[PDB]
Amino acid sequence: EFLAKAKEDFLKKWETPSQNTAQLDQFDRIKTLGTGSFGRVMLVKHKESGNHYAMKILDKQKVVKLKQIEHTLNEKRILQAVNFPFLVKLEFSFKDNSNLYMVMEYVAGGEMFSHLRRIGRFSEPHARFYAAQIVLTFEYLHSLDLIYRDLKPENLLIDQQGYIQVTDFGFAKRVKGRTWTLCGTPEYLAPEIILSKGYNKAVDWWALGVLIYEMAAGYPPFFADQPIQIYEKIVSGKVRFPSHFSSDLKDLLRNLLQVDLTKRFGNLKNGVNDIKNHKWFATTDWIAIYQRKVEAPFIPKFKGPGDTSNFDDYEEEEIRVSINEKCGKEFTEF
């Protein structure tokens, strides 16, 4: 139902993105929630409303130096245009002489990553609860001709109701047809990305296979010390399963972690419904998940607004803003 109206709303925002909807001095910067190659994400408090937000800060010069301009513009153009129960909400965006800023709702429960490593592994119903939300999220994204391209626990945040909010649209792209960029995170890369094959949205379904495996096992299906060692294992595709995996889960994973593109679940004629109707998801009420009516297996501890106890600590750096505008032309549309 939602999808028809949702594509029309998406397309309107896609064609005319919002721009310049706040400025830096409207926020108190509190502390760093995560660091990345082009900047960092900080907890901030909006001075007027008192609300807390997560502000992603990107260094314009570094983005240009590493030739990531298009990905960065993709990221913001797409995130401001989407709307879904399991996607982080972008509230404001702006830029100054030095930086780009994307201010999202603060998701205080922390990364799925943190909880997964602490607990060790998730039981299959727990993993299935999260997996169902990703399945629905990809159904939404793919219907908008979006590919996501960086599914991993580090990019999945747990909210106050214990549901997932997907963050990090760094590699999100609107593409009808195939695309070729080598991007993602090594453990989650589909074989066709590694082989420089050209690829499509099926790489997101492969990544879901890796995610479900990692959630249920406590370690990813292909791991080593060096990415190249991981890549060798991925293209070979000889996955082995923990003995505690159910038969249904192994069957699903064999169909998602399918090296042959044209046999992989998610990418056949029946699309997402091959996954939704798979026996492992037999107990999943897709509508109740979508409506967020299912009680979550896990609810993070929260000590108030602005509580960061579910995040690692990072060393803080001053936000530097040059008195000269950098890379103005490159980021005109941001």
């Binding site: 995560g34 080598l182 991007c183 993602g184 090594p186 923990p242």
Partner: peptide, 20 residues
Amino acid sequence: TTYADFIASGRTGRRASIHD
């Protein structure tokens, strides 16, 4: 165990994305 092998490996912490 496979879990013990994973926990002793070099990639159990947050993993950065790759690009270009």
